[PDB]
Amino acid sequence: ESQTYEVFEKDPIKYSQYQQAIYKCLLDRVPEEEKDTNVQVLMVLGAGRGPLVNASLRAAKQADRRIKLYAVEKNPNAVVTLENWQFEEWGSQVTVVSSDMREWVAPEKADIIVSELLGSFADNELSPECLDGAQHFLKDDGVSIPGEYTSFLAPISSSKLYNEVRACREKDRDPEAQFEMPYVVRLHNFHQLSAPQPCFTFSHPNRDPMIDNNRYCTLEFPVEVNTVLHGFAGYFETVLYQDITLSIRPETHSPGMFSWFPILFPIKQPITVREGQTICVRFWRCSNSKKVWYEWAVTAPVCSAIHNPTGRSYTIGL
Amino acid sequence: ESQTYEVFEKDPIKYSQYQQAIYKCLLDRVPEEEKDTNVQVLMVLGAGRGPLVNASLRAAKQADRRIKLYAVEKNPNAVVTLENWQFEEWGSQVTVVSSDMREWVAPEKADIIVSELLGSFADNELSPECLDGAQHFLKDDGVSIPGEYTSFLAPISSSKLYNEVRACREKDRDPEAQFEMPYVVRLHNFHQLSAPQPCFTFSHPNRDPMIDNNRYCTLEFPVEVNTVLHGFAGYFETVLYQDITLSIRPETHSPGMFSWFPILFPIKQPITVREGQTICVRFWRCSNSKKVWYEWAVTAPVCSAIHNPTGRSYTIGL
Amino acid sequence: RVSSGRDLNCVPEIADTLGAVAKQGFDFLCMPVFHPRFKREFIQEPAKNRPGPQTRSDLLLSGRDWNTLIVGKLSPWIRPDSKVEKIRRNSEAAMLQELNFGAYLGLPAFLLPLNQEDNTNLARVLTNHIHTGHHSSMFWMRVPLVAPEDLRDDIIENAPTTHTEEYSGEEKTWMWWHNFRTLCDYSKRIAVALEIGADLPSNHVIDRWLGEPIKAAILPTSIFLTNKKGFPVLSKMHQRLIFRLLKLEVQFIITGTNHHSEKEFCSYLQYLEYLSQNRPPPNAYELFAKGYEDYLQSPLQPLMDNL
Amino acid sequence: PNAPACMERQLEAARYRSDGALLLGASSLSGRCWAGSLWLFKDPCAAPNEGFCSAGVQTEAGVADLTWVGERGILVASDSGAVELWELDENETLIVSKFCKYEHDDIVSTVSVLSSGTQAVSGSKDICIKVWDLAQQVVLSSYRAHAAQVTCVAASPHKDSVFLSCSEDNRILLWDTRCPKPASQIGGYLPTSLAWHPQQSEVFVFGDENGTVSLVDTKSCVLSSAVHSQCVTGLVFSPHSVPFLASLSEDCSLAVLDSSLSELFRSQAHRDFVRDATWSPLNHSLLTTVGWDHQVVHHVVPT
Ligand SMILES: Nc1nc2cc(CN3C(=O)c4cc(F)ccc4[C@]34CCN(Cc3ccc(F)cc3)C4=O)[nH]c2cc1F
Ligand SMILES: Nc1nc2cc(CN3C(=O)c4cc(F)ccc4[C@]34CCN(Cc3ccc(F)cc3)C4=O)[nH]c2cc1F
C-alpha cells in the first residue's frame, strides 16, 4: 500500500547509507579522467515510490559522475507514483519500467544494480530469487548493491510472546499453524539466552554453477543459565558495497535506523534448558517452483517436531 | 501411480479411436506417391506408460506410412516404464523425452501432436494450457489430436448426492468447502432436470491472438417438472481428428468406453424449481500464473452464492 | 451534527477541489481515481502499450487525507456485464485496476453502480477483489430508489411510459441489490448508497429498504424545491424520508451542479442541518439505547449464573 | 504566442472552418492536473506545436467535445457539467469566454449546433438532453428521454427542430421539437456515433460499440458492414457531392467508405485512440485525424 511505502521512506539513515554506497561505487568504477566520457547504467530493481532513484541522483551529484537510471517495479500502483515523479521532476534520465525483474527483457546491461528487497530475516522477501533472475542483464564486471546479506538467529525465553503466538489460533486451519510461521515483532519482554549466530548468507552476483538457494544450517547455542526456550529471534546484516552496511543485529545495530523489527520463529512446545546445556537448532531454507519457506527443529537438549514441513503453515510466494 | 495408468490402459475403445484418428491423419498428410519419402514427426505429449506410442505404431502399420515418434512425459516414474519398453521393444524410432511439454526445447517441429490430457470436464486437467505451451514446436500446417473438445453441463436433483457432499466436511478448513469443488462420480440415484448444454470449448492449435483460456458462460435450462436442484452434472465431448470422437455425454456417449465418470458441481443450498421455470447457471473458467479454477453461480429462478471465489476451496495446479 | 459529503465526477486539481468542498462544510469527497473518460485497453495493440502515467500520484494528498476524506468511484465506461466479449474482458481488468488502486491509497469506501438488473460478473470480480489480500475498505453500491427507465419523461412518441401499477415491477431496484449481495454471499464490506429521485415511489417500495445496510443516501440537487426566500428546500414527502434516514444515521451525499446559482452550495447542507436539529428529540429509551443499536448480546441466566 | 506554454496529451477533437483553419481541442486525462484547452492553427501542418499557433487558451476542465460555431465561435462540452461558448476576437489571436453555464449534473459528453446557428443541443452522462439558445445564453428545454448515458447527439444539417441522439440504453432517438412528444425511437449493440447524410435530409449513419457501421433511412431495411474491430467513436462525411464516409475507432485505425459501405482507404497511423476527423475544405482529398497519441496526421484519400 501507499502508507507501507511511506513508512519505509521515513527512514533517512537507510537511504543515506545507500546514497553513500552508490557514491563510492561510482568513484571506483569511473576514474577522474573519464568523468564526462563514461555514463554508468544504474538499475533500481524494485523502485517503489522511488527513494533509491532519488538517492542515486544525489549520489551521482556528490560524486560528480554521469548516470543512466532505470526504475524497474512490478507493483503497478507504485508505478503511478514513479511516472508522475518522472514526468515532473526526473525526466528522460530515469526510464520507468513496469515489469517483474525476472521477466523484463533489458535493452541494455547494467554496471550497477540497486535493490531494497530485504526483510527482517534478509532473504524472507526472496531477494535471492529475484536478483538471480535479474542477474543476466548485469555486466560481467557489474556490481550489486547490496552485494551480500546474512541472517542471524538467537534463542529466546519469553512466556509472554509464547502466550501471544498461542492466541493467534484461527478457525478453519491447523490448531498449531500459528507456531509454524515467523512474526515481525519488537521484542521487549523477553530474554536472549545466547549470542546471535549467522544462519544463511547470500552473495550477489552469484557465480556458483547451478545456483541453489536451498540451505540447511545447524547452530549450537551455549546456555549459561536455567531457562525455558520459547522461540528464536531473527536478525540480519547486509553489505551494500564495502564498508557500507546495514544491520538489526543488537550488537552491530545501525544507530537510529528503524526500518526492520526483529523476526520470531516460535516452537510448539517450550523446552527447559539447564545451565551448561547447549541449545541446538536446525534451519532449512526450502523451495519449489511456486513457493519458498523455512522449516526448523530443535535437536538439543531435547528434540522438537520439525516446524512448517512442506510449508504447510507458511509459504513465501514466488 | 502405476495402477492409475493401468486402469486408463484397460479401455481399448478409447485407444482404438486414437489409433483410427492417427491412421486417417497419416493418409491425409502423406499421399501414396510419397509413402517412403515422407516420414511424419509424431509427438505424444504426456505418454504415460505408452498406450498412444503403441497406438501410433499400430496406426502407422495399418496405414503403411513412416513415422518418427517422440514420447514427452513429465512424470519421471512413468518414464522408467517408457525407457524399459523403448529399449526392449520400440527402439530408436521412439525418442523418450523426460520433460514438461511447456518447457521442452524441441530439436524438430512436429507434423502431428497427440495428447491424452482430458478429464471428465475436458479442460479440468489444463489441457488448454499444456497444449498452448507445446504449440510452438508444431509445424505451421501441423495437426493436434485432439483438435477440439467441449464440456457440457446439466442440472440435477439428487437428495442422495447432496447429502453425500455434505458429509465431506473436514477439520481445519472452511465448513462449506466441500460444496465449492467438483467430484468425479458415477451418477446413479439422481434426476437430470434438463438436457445437457455446451459450456466451454477449446480448439488446438489455437490461432486467436493473445490466447486466453479464461471463460464465462451463461446457460438457461428449461425445466418441465417441479424439483429441487442440488448441483450440475458435467460431461464432455472431444474431436480427435474429424469424424473420430470420444464422448461421455449421455445422448452421444461412446459405447463401451469407461475411462471417464461424470463430474459433479454441487451448490451450498438446494434450490426449489417449479414446472415451467428456467434454471440459469453461470460458469467461469479462471486462472492466474499458478492456478486454474472454476467458479459458478445460479441466477434463476433464485440466486445462489458464487461458488469457489478466487479458487479458495478448489484449484487446479499449473 | 449530520455527517455529509460531496459527489463530484470532475476534479481538475485534487488539492484545490478538497479546499472548496471543506470550506462548504462537507466532511468527505466522492471522486474518481482515474479520469472518467480515460478509457484503457488491456488486450489489443497498440492501445494497450499506451505510455505515460495512468492517473494522479498518491503523493498529492497525505495518507490520512486518503483514509478519511476521499471516497473512490468506479469509472463510468467500466461495464463488466457487457454483451460484447471485448468490453467485458477490458472492464474486468479495469475494474480490478481501479479497485486495487483504491486499496493502495487506503480509501475508507469505494462507490460501484447498480444501474441494471444483471450485475453478475460485476459481483464475481468484486468478490474476487474482496478475497485478495486484506482490507477494511467498504464498498458502497450506488442503487436508485426508482430505476432510470421508470422515471424517464414520457416524451417518446412510439414508446410511452408504463402507466400500469406493477407492484413487483416498482420494487425492481431492491431486487437488483438483493441478487448482487446474495452472489457476494452477504459480505459485511458491501453496503448500499441509496440514490433518492425527484418523484419518490410508492410507500411499499421504500419499506423494501428497511433492514438493509444503508450507509449513504445520495441526494441530487435537482430534487430540491425553492422557497419564497429563494433557497433550496425539500417536499414534505422527502422531509419524512430524510427524518427516517436520520434515525439510521446514514451519511448524506450531495451530487449534481448548483441549480440554486444565486445562493452558495452550503445552503443544501445547511438545510439538512436544519432538518437534523428539527426532529423529535430522543426519549429516555432512545437516550439510553443510543449505543446498543443492533448489538447482539447473550440472554442473561441469573439461575445458572450469579449476576 | 499569447497562449498556454504546453497543450495536453490527449487530443479529443479537430475541425476545419470555411477558409481552412484547424481547430483543436485537447484534454489531460492523466497526471496531476485534469484540465482542457482550445487551439487554432491557420497553418494545419504546424500542429500540434504550441509555438506556431494563431490562438490558444486554457479551460477550467477537460474538453469532451466541441464544434465549429460559424468562424469565430467555439462551443465546448466540459467535464464540469457546463456548456462553454468561446469567441475569437477580431484579430483572431485571443479566445475570450462568452458563456459558461453549469446546467448538466455530470460530464457533458456531446454537443452539436442546429441549423439556425443561434441554438445547440447537448448530451451528458446524466440522462438529460438540453436545448440551448446562444443569444440569451439560457436552456430552452430539458429532456430526460433516454435511460442511460447520452453518447452522441447530432443536429440535422438543414432542419432546426430535428436532431438525432443515441445512448447506452440502446436507443437511437430521432427528435422534432415541434411535436408534443418530440423523441421517436428508430427500430443489438449499443450506438456510439451518429452522422447525418449531407445531401439527403432523411438519411443518416451510426457506428456501434461492436465496430459495425450502419446505413439507415428515416423511412425504414438497413445496410451495414463490419469496418472496425472495436467501438466506432465518430463518423464524418466528406464535402464531395458524392460523399465519402470517414470512420474512426478505438482499434487505432481509420477507414474511408463509399456509398455502399465498401472499404476504400485504410490507415493504421495512430498508436492510440482515434478521436476525430475533419476533411480539408480547400483540398477535399485531404483528411486530418487526431488521437490520444498526440499525433495530427494528414491523410491523402484516393479520390
Ligand atoms: N523491501 C523492504 N522490505 C521490508 C521489510 C520490513 C520490515 N517490516 C515488516 O516485515 C513488517 C510487517 C508488518 F506487518 C508491519 C511492519 C513491518 C516492517 C516495516 C516497518 N517496520 C519497522 C517499524 C514498524 C512500525 C513502527 F512503528 C516502527 C518501525 C517493520 O518491522 N521493512 C522493509 C523495507 C523494505 F524496503
Ligand atoms: N489424462 C487422463 N485423465 C483422465 C481423467 C479420468 C477420469 N477419472 C478421474 O478423474 C478419476 C478420479 C478418481 F479419484 C478416480 C478415478 C478417476 C477416473 C479414472 C478412471 N475413471 C473411470 C472408472 C473408474 C473406476 C471404475 F471402476 C470404472 C471406471 C474415472 O472416473 N480418466 C482419464 C484418462 C486420462 F488419460
Ligand SMILES: CSC[C@H]1O[C@@H](n2cnc3c(N)ncnc32)[C@H](O)[C@@H]1O
Ligand atoms: C521498495 S520495497 C521493494 C520493492 O520491490 C518490488 N519488487 C519485489 N519483487 C520484484 C520483482 N521481482 N520485480 C520487480 N519489482 C519487484 C516491490 O513491489 C517493492 O515495491
Ligand SMILES: CSC[C@H]1O[C@@H](n2cnc3c(N)ncnc32)[C@H](O)[C@@H]1O
Ligand atoms: C496418460 S495421462 C496424461 C499424461 O500426461 C502427462 N502430462 C501432463 N501434463 C504434462 C506436461 N505439461 N508435460 C508433459 N507431460 C504432461 C501426465 O504426467 C500423464 O502421464
